[PDB]
Design a protein that fits this description.
part of a larger assembly; 10 chains; A alpha+beta; B mainly alpha; D mainly beta; E alpha+beta; F alpha+beta; I mainly alpha; A: alpha+beta; Gyrase A, domain 2; RNA Polymerase Alpha Subunit, Chain A, domain 2; 4-stranded antiparallel beta sheet; 10 strands; globular; E: alpha+beta; 4 strands; flat; binds magnesium ion; binds zinc ion; RNA-binding
RNA sequence: AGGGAACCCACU
């Protein structure tokens, strides 16, 4: 009548991905965690752009959209920041935002590439991921001589459920029952399906025998980061955030039950 | 001398490419107006 | 003088005839534009065969 | 009051007065473009 | 022109209640829990946890319409038990499992990083 | 025999498996631009006053 | 024929027909005869030899051109009447000797049979695998697809213009697309498409779109509209002047604000505008006194930002302005999309990334189309395009979907796809996004070139409740 | 386009290589508006002298 | 017109890859090898690079309005 | 409101609906009402009229609401049935070997608006509790209606042998006392034909109960389809090598038979049938040979299909496609015709300049011996284009004749 | 306070 007791193993941990296995949990929990990785892990991204000058060949909304998509290091600041909608400030304050400025003019005869390196932050710890000290800088726009781009932007906290620019992942691999022992899929011709990298079948065996008493256990994840957070921090933030959602629901339900 | 099949495909598209390098696609309009 | 004849673009008697892509771009014309049409009161007209 | 226009050919800013015909004071070109507004332009980056 | 704002899917509107409880009158010991501004994430985990409870006779959830942000959870229990109790205990169990999982992930990360 | 009429609307149709067969989903801007004249009675005066 | 092939007295354009059964020879030098070039066959051999191909390969340097082929009497122009007398080989394989020769008296050979297609039908991949009405439908829809219509669009003030943010060239192309400049000015995006039933919102030709992809610029476009106006001094009594009208002097002023106008009576680039907003202030002197407002207003129900404002004189020397207003269009429910195989649909719903079905890798479909389109449409070209596109993205090359190519068949493509670790028929195991459970059936998924058509719901939606009426009959206005 | 004889709207055999067999409007003009095949050319005429 | 910042399908950053990819091609890499070298494994990201058309250079061929 | 799609051909082209307000900019329609309107979602637009008085509102409510329009007096049968995903999925759902676990059942019951809240006893209690698709669907059926139908794949001799009442293939549909006792549902049972389940529901219960029946079938089955899935791919268009060799042999024999007929006619050994000139007799024999070849190859292709084949799934459910479509995708495309005849000699005694004069063989006159999967040769491509043009023209002219 | 005709393209 009670809670699962999941265990975890990390099989790979780099700067850009974390690969791990959760055992002794239910499929619904595993999938909910996956969903939270994508859509409910908060991140900092540009969401307010004032354009003072733009002589480039790209119109203002084009530039603003591209700026919105630039990933910014969020690793420790994002937990401190408040949601702009919740802040008592009137416009934007250091408690709910990070200011950026960009001011580039092409005065030479070679094309000027405006990259994320030209985005100057007010916070040393919230900067474009490609500016962190190989990977080039993210191109924003290209300028020829006499063209100019001058703007001011604010980055705020959000999550992928609102807009994909706040999605911290670059692909969440997820998989269970690599050998199709539960028959959750049915192959018309099993032998022509390639083995999963987590398969433990011999080369002559196409799928495991059917298991009438089996349940999905042992979920395999490979969470790739877009750079805004470290992959393990994505996972931990997801676990904490889902727990917070459940706690808030519990508080509201307690009020509702007591009110009757 | 003779173009062989394995060469034929490349050869035919080289001929067609040269045609379009010479004529373009609105040659009939321009030629008629020039006349 | 007996009148004016609208000129088909990129034909032999158009100002763009023979220009290089760089010359076309200096005139704010697209090099890929095929021509073969007229400009009558600013409007691009094509004759249908 | 100024009403600055940009010449389409020589890219020269030059004053124009309503009821004044359109003509670049430098090169005599007859096509001019208005300059970008000074009003606040703000976009969500979405 | 008719696009809803993106925040509409997770921000409660003024006066809107997070969760409402009604009795299901067709059968005894059954309740419908309406939750606003939640989707399959919470609905699915809560339903699966409820199905783990041996005193729960029925548990299910649905999103009535994908363009709206409401989930309905229906719970029926045995007469010696209450759907409110089952719902509360399911949330407590889920929180416990998540806390354990977070601790163990922290430990595993530390092991991997050390060596 | 035919005429143009007031109180009409037109837009693209898209499927909805979550509507009853006797329902039709209508965008808000259409709903906000079209009106039904409701007669005020003591039954409905409060609702219509708020409207 | 010898003279024409030498280009001595008879120009290439001339047609010479001998009707043997009759005893007539007909020679035509008229204008207006449609003709096409064909390779000349003598005995049973092409006159085109390896040396001609060698000389053409270096046409950049040596300047050997198509005209030299025609001059050397290796290619000929044949009009329809002369074609009546030609014995035509489809490919040089028809000249190869055979156990029972069919003809053995060929006079000409096709250069390539795909040249029977026009410009629009030449972008269809594998058109020889589709039912023909479907090729006809794509031939129209391709003219409705958004791309970058011309490279100098910034300097053009067209009445209407659509521009796609991020056009791609197709992963699967035909060889004739090189000459249509489709590479340079493409009109679509390679999309990860799944052919699946998923929640019901792509039934009856509708499609399901990935909202997270749309958030990232997938099929985002920009719509431009140009407004023009001129001030006429036609008569000494009445004259029109660009100006910012005031309610003390001018009379017919709508309730729209005129403060968006500059002192010259014109709006400035960068100003946000909405329907029934003035963009050109213009007054005409009467024969609230002495001036009648005749300003230009933005079209009703439209919105945007002023892109640029051009001022000139027209032919008769009157001041003349054109204003381009830009409007960004994010794909939404009701917008229309089409593959290159006559498979068109409107977007029925959009799901975020986490709600979409997913492969064991992180890959979700950009678009989900419904399997009930295929069986009766028989657009097998679309399926083969998806298979080859998956191969081409994995291998890092552009697939060749030129129609009548014997070197390509479905089994070969399948074998290649198996080499990259996918099921050879293009199917994958997908997981339901809502629950994480596997889907029992495996799903056909891969990259397919999709087009965004100009038909957008926000340009069609309309309602009325007692508006303006016609003068003669008092019935509601049209349109 | 008001005429209702199918015969002139049909795809005649002699269109091969001259006129695209696929591209044609699907409305009232089906079969009456045509498009040139890729390598088709139209003669401009010359003196028979 | 310009390389998208993210892969439409998965959100991986590709906007910092176009110049590198052009460099690798001129160094005689095949497209498949170059995409492997840049770390583009999923075929969605590979589509992003393989199918891009850099129209912004053509646009940069025109003189700007303001000097 | 009154909803309408042009052209307005019959009563059911204008029906009353209740308004529901939704976010985006389109009119949203339930899938089953597409049939009366002849609507689909490829750019169609429909009109809305808002009655302006209580009297016109009452008129629409009492005379023209969608549920009252379920049966048409044109042909005394329903105008609306179950279509597309729901139809293909319900065919799969009601197969004999569909088993559902406790959780899946509870979810589906979540989508059943008329459910009385009692979980039925599972059909299998041990070793594990499992419900069948038929039990859930029985929960969907209203009242206690009684109906007998046959599935589309029902063998013709089954009803006269043993097993008449215990179908080996589960191809006899029996609804008794509102319960689906046996049989696979398809278009014959849930479509618009007279005597279908939806027809009997309308006749036995009112329009209101039947409205709920339509909606519940859709919601429950679509949600099950989320587990089952449904696709179509390249793999459904392929056949085994034995099938391909059989098809090629059939085509080769048919070609040799046509050659023999031609050689007979060329030696004046062919005698006309009564009421036919000699050329009509030759064309009759040639067309007979080629039609027989097309039928035989189509049958071979249809026999090759497995029970997992998705083309077959959509054909057997009756949701989309026909056996001819399968034959043309897998086996040959077949004869191309203009004005009811083989491709005419548009050149002088030739269909194209690639043939010799007076060639009456299959290839020359427009027999497409390839499948859509194999791809058409250039001449086949052109002849197929001629054939398709014919249909486009028919549409574009018949419209005005019929309108008048 | 507000027009109209004609023609062309296109959508279901
Ligand atoms: Mg339609
Ligand atoms: Zn603040
Ligand atoms: Zn100047
Ligand atoms: Zn990707």
């Amino acid at each position: 009548p009670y809670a699962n007791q999941p265990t975890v193993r990390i099989t790979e941990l780099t700067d850009e991905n974390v690969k791990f296995i959760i055992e002794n949990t239910d499929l619904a929990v595993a999938n909910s965690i996956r969903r939270v990785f994508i859509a409910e892990v908060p991140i900092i991204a540009i969401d307010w752009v004032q354009i003072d000058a733009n002589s480039s060949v790209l119109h203002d909304e084009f530039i603003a959209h591209r700026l919105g998509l630039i990933p910014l290091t969020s690793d420790d600041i994002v937990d401190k920041l408040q949601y702009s909608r919740d802040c008592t400030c009137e416009e934007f304050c250091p408690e709910c935002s990070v200011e950026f400025t960009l001011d580039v003019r092409c005065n030479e005869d070679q094309t000027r590439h405006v990259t994320s390196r030209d985005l100057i932050s007010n916070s040393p710890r919230v900067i474009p991921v490609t500016s962190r000290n190989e990977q080039d800088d993210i191109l924003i726009v290209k300028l020829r001589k006499g063209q100019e781009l001058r703007l001011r932007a604010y980055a705020k906290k959000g999550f992928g459920k609102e807009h994909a620019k706040w999605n911290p992942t670059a692909g969440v691999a997820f998989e269970y029952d690599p050998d199709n022992a539960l028959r959750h899929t049915v192959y018309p011709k099993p032998e022509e399906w390639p083995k999963s990298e987590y398969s433990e079948l011999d080369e002559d065996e196409s799928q495991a025998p059917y298991d009438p008493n089996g349940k999905p256990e042992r979920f395999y994840y490979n969470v790739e980061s877009c750079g805004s957070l470290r992959p393990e921090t994505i996972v931990l933030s997801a676990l904490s955030g889902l727990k917070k959602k459940l706690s808030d629901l519990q508080t509201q339900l307690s009020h509702e039950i007591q009110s009757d | 001398d003779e173009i062989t099949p394995d060469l034929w495909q490349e050869a035919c598209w080289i001929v067609i490419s040269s045609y379009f390098d010479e004529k373009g696609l609105v040659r009939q309009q321009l030629d008629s107006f020039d006349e | 003088f007996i009148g004016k004849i609208p000129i088909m673009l990129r034909s032999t008697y158009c100002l763009l005839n023979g220009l290089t892509d760089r010359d076309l771009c200096e005139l704010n014309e697209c090099p890929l534009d095929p021509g073969g049409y007229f400009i009558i009161n600013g409007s691009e007209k094509v004759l249908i065969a | 009051q100024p009403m600055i226009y940009i010449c389409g050919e020589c890219h020269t800013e030059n004053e124009i007065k309503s009821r004044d015909p359109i003509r670049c004071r430098e090169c005599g070109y007859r096509i001019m473009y208005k300059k970008r507004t000074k009003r606040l332009v703000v976009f969500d980056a979405r | 022109m008719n696009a809803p704002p993106a925040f509409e899917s997770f921000l409660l509107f003024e006066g809107e209640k997070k969760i409402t409880i009604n009795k299901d009158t067709k059968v005894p010991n059954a309740c419908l829990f309406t939750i606003n501004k939640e989707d399959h994430t919470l609905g699915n985990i809560i339903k699966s946890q409820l199905l783990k409870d041996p005193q729960v006779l029925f548990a299910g959830y649905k999103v009535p319409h994908p363009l709206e942000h409401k989930i309905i959870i229906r719970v029926q229990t045995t007469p010696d038990y209450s759907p409110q109790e089952a719902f509360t205990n399911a949330i407590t169990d889920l929180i416990s499992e998540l806390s354990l999982l977070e601790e163990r992930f922290r430990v595993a990360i530390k092991d991997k990083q050390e060596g | 025999m035919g005429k143009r009429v007031d109180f009409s609307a037109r837009t693209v149709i898209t499927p909805d498996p979550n509507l009853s067969i006797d329902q039709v989903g209508v965008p808000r801007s259409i709903a906000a631009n079209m009106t039904f004249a409701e007669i005020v009675t003591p039954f409905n005066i409060d609702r219509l006053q708020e409207l | 024929r010898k003279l024409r092939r030498q280009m001595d007295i008879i120009v290439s354009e001339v047609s010479m027909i001998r009707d043997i059964r009759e005893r007539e020879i007909r020679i035509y030098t008229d204008a207006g005869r449609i003709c096409r070039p064909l390779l000349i066959v003598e005995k049973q051999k092409l006159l085109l030899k390896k040396r001609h191909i060698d000389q053409l390969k270096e046409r950049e340097y040596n300047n050997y051109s198509w005209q030299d082929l025609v001059a050397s009497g290796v290619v000929e122009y044949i009009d329809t009447l002369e074609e009546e007398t030609v014995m035509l080989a489809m490919t040089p394989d028809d000249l190869q000797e055979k156990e029972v020769a069919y003809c053995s008296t060929y006079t000409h050979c096709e250069i390539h049979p795909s040249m029977i297609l026009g410009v629009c039908a030449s972008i269809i991949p594998f058109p020889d695998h589709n039912q023909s009405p479907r090729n006809t439908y794509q031939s129209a829809m391709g003219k409705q697809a958004m791309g970058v219509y011309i490279t100098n669009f910034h300097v053009r003030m067209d009445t209407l213009a659509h521009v796609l943010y991020y056009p791609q060239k197709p992963l699967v192309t035909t060889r004739s697309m090189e000459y249509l400049r489709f590479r340079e000015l493409p009109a679509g995006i390679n999309s990860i498409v799944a052919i699946a039933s998923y929640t019901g919102y792509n039934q009856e030709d509708s499609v399901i779109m990935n909202r997270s992809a749309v958030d990232r610029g997938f099929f985002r476009s920009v719509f431009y509209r140009s407004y023009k106006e001129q001030e006429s001094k036609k008569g000494f009594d009445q004259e029109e002047v660009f100006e910012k009208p005031t309610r003390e002097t001018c009379q017919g002023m709508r309730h729209a604000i005129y403060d968006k106008l500059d002192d010259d009576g014109l709006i400035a680039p960068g100003v946000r505008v909405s329907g029934d907003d003035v963009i050109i202030g213009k007054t005409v002197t009467l024969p609230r006194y002495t001036k009648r407002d005749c300003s230009t207003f933005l079209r009703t129900s439209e919105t945007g930002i002023v892109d640029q404002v051009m001022v000139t004189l027209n032919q008769e020397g009157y001041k003349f302005c054109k204003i381009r207003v830009r409007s960004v269009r994010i794909p939404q429910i009701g917008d229309k999309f089409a593959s290159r195989h006559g498979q068109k649909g409107t977007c029925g719903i959009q799901y975020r990334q986490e709600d979409m079905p997913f492969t064991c890798e992180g890959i979700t479909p950009d678009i989900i189309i419904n399997p009930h389109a295929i069986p009766s449409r028989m657009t097998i070209g679309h399926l083969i395009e998806c298979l080859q596109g998956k191969v081409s993205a994995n291998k890092g090359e552009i697939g060749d979907a030129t129609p009548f190519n014997d070197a390509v068949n479905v089994q070969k493509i399948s074998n290649l796809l198996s080499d990259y670790g996918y099921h050879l028929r293009g199917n994958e195991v997908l997981y339901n996004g809502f629950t994480g459970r596997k889907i029992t059936s495996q799903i056909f998924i891969g990259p397919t070139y999709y087009q965004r058509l100009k038909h957008m719901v926000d340009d069609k939606i309309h309602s009325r409740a007692r508006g303006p009426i016609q003068i003669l009959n008092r019935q509601p206005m049209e349109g | 386009r008001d005429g209702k004889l199918a015969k002139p709207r049909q795809l005649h055999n002699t269109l091969w290589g001259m006129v695209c067999p696929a591209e044609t409007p699907e409305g009232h003009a089906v079969g009456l508006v045509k498009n040139l095949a890729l390598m088709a050319y139209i003669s401009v005429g010359s003196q028979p002298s | 017109m310009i390389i998208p910042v993210r892969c439409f399908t998965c959100g991986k950053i590709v906007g910092n890859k176009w110049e590198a990819y052009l460099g690798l091609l001129q160094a005689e890499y095949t497209e498949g090898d170059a995409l492997d070298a840049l770390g583009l494994k999923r075929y969605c990201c590979r589509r992003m690079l393989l199918a891009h058309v850099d129209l912004i250079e053509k646009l940069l061929n025109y003189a700007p309005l303001e000097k | 409101v009154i909803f309408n799609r042009q052209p307005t051909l019959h009563k059911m082209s204008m029906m009353g609906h209740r308004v529901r307000i939704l976010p985006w900019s389109t009119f949203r329609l339930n899938l089953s009402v597409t049939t009366p309107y002849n609507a689909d979602f490829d750019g169609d637009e429909m009109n809305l009229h808002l009655p302006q008085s209580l009297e016109t509102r009452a008129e629409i409510q009492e005379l023209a609401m969608v549920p009252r329009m379920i049966v048409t007096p044109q042909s005394n049968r329903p105008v609306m049935g179950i279509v597309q995903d729901t139809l293909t999925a319900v065919r799969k759902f009601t197969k004999r070997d569909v088993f559902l676990e406790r959780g899946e059942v509870m979810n589906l019951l979540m989508f059943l608006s008329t459910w009385d809240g009692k979980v039925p006893q599972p059909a299998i209690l041990k070793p594990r509790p499992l419900w069948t698709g038929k039990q859930i669907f029985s929960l969907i059926i209203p009242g206690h209606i009684n109906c007998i139908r046959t599935h589309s794949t029902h063998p013709d001799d089954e009803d006269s042998g043993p097993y008449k009442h215990i179908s080996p293939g589960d191809t006899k549909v029996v609804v008794e006392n509102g319960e689906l006792i046996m049989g696979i549902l398809c278009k014959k049972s849930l479509g618009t034909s007279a005597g279908s389940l939806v027809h009997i529901s309308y006749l036995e219960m009112g329009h209101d109960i039947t409205r709920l029946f339509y909606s519940n079938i859709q919601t429950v089955i679509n949600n099950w389809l989320l587990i089952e899935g449904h696709t179509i791919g390249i793999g459904d268009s392929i056949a085994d090598s034995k099938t391909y060799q059989d098809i090629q042999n059939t085509i080769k024999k048919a070609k040799q038979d046509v050659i023999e007929v031609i050689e007979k006619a060329h030696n004046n050994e062919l005698e006309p049938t009564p009421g036919n000139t000699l050329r009509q007799t030759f064309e009759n024999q040639v067309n007979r040979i080629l039609n027989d070849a097309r039928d035989k190859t189509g049958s071979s292709a249809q026999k090759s299909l497995s029970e997992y084949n998705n083309f077959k799934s959509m054909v057997v459910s009756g949701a989309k496609g026909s056996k001819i479509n399968i034959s043309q995708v897998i086996a040959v495309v077949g004869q191309q015709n203009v004005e009811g005849k083989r491709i005419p000699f548009g050149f002088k005694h030739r269909t194209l300049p690639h043939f010799i004069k007076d060639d009456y063989g299959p290839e020359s006159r427009g027999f497409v011996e390839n499948s859509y999967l194999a791809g058409l040769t250039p001449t086949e491509f052109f002849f197929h284009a001629m054939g398709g043009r014919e249909g486009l023209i028919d549409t574009a002219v018949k419209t005005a004749e019929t309108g008048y």
